[PDB]
Design a protein around this ligand. Sequence first.
Ligand SMILES: *[C@@H]1O[C@H](CO)[C@@H](O)[C@H](O)[C@H]1NC(C)=O
Ligand SMILES: O=c1cc[nH]c(=O)[nH]1
Length: 246
Amino acid sequence: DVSFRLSGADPSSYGMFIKDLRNALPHTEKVYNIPLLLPSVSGAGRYLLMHLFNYDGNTITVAVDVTNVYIMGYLALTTSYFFNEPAADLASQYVFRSARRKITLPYSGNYERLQIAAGKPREKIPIGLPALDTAISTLLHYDSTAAAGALLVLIQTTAEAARFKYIEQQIQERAYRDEVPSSATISLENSWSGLSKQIQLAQGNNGVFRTPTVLVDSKGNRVQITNVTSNVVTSNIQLLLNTKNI
Ligand SMILES: *[C@@H]1O[C@H](CO)[C@@H](O)[C@H](O)[C@H]1NC(C)=O
Ligand SMILES: O=c1cc[nH]c(=O)[nH]1
């Protein structure tokens, strides 16, 4: 299991938590020196528990599908919660079995469905380590409308940062001031599937992307990713969703 304590957290202990997280995710092979997530993992081994502790030391435990880095569900004290989706329901029969009651949330775990429940797109939702602390607190006591917004902040402060250095870095400067995510930070949230695909198709294409990926850069300028020699591939991206899943 991997852990992260928001009490006395610095951009350092956050980096370390994000490091742990990446290494919790199995892979036999690297593609252009980037871990290749497995096609599938049979049973409870499919899921990763994250123990998170808000500032006042209350905790929740977030289960993550390791083939794709998706949040499936989490546990608050003695109540488990899983999204409204078949993988989550699947995920539910391996983890938090000891929860007194299990609650299916009223949405599947994708940004579109999450953003509607919350009533705002994630471009207007501050994120950072405080907004993570909040999240943890919000989900401690059920409120589906609130828990939407708080899951958009948990997904991003965890899954996305682990996936991408840049975003991890965007979270470390938001160590003490939340802030809405940069336009690029979103681009990369939305392009993960694409990049995981193209980086893998470049294996027998001489490092060229069968289909270029359109991004936004740090500056707010739209740009195209045609090849593995782009900084995004060499520097940024830390994990690849197996094409056996796209
Ligand atoms: C590769 O990408 C770099 C940086 O984006 C660019 O300068 C170059 O024209 C591209 N080369 C190939 C072979 O795709
Ligand atoms: O939509 C997404 C993308 C990544 N991780 C999630 O939990 N949901």
